[PDB]
Amino acid sequence: EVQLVESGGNVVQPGGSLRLSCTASGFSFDDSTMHWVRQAPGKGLQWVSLISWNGGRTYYADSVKGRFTISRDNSKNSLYLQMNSLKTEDTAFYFCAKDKGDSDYDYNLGYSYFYYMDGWGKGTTVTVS
Amino acid sequence: LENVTENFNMWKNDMVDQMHEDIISLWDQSLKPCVKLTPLCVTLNCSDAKV
Ligand SMILES: *[C@@H]1O[C@H](CO)[C@@H](O)[C@H](O)[C@H]1NC(C)=O
Ligand SMILES: *[C@@H]1O[C@H](CO)[C@@H](O)[C@H](O)[C@H]1NC(C)=O
Predict the structure, then answer these.
(1) Which DSSP string do the residues of A68-106 spell out, in sequence order?
(2) Which residues carry attached sugars according to the database record (chain B) (predicted)?
(3) Which of the residues A6, A85, B33, B41 has the least number of beta carbons within 10 Å of its own beta carbon?
(4) Nearest CA in chain B to A107
């Protein structure tokens, strides 16, 4: 049993910035990778960003690679995803979801990391302009 | 030799059999130390070549 909580969403304007705080507990972040997706009304899921324990494997989706950055720390076990240069078609409920972080190792091929969300947070809110 | 006769069947000759054996071993020995290209073959995404 794990819980994820997010806060900091409010009215936003295009070209502005917003600070989003997403704390969680019940699972250590030392060996956990956090995801980010958004759920616009009437539409399917969309991938936003990915992050590893320290760095690398922080790949971003094609349409949201402009100036979006995600950072993590171990001191207080929380995550951030600051919104920047908000467009007029990127308004939706952003969701942060835990990942199991399973892997595999073959001497010839090397480390292979699999990705699939396990736990999900309550959800945030966005409103352009 | 001056005046002597002998017969032999080359198909039963073992000089050729030994030559095949050691030549095969020689090639294997030369390839022992240097790298093996096992990791290379993965899912390759190939369409065509510009040239
Ligand atoms: C390296 O490990 C320390 C351990 O406390 C952690 O605080 C730090 O964030 C790690 N490095 C990075 C780049 O996060
Ligand atoms: C063999 O040949 C030699 C010459 O090369 C000859 O002198 C001798 O008589 C021959 N022997 C036989 C058995 O034919």
Answers:
(1) --EEEETTTTEEEE-EES--SS--SEEEEEEE---EEEE
(2) 3, 45
(3) B33
(4) B39
Q: Which of A32, A74, A76, A80 to mutate to test the pocket of ligand 1 (most atoms within 8 A of CB)?
A: A74
- Minimum-distance ligand 2 atom for the alpha carbon of B2: 5
Experimental technique of record: cryo-EM
Kind and range of the H or E run holding A36? strand A34-39
For B16, the token pair is 């050729």
B3 lines ligand 2 (CB under 6 A): yes
Report the SS3 class of residue A64.
Answer: helix
How many CA atoms are closer than 13 Å to the CA of B10, on its beta-carbon side? 1
Resolution of the structure in the document, Å: 3.9
**Which residue carries 């005046």 as its tokens?**
B3
The token pair at A67 is 């100036």
Report, in angstroms and rounded to the nearest whole number, the Rg of chain B calculated over CA atoms. Answer: 24
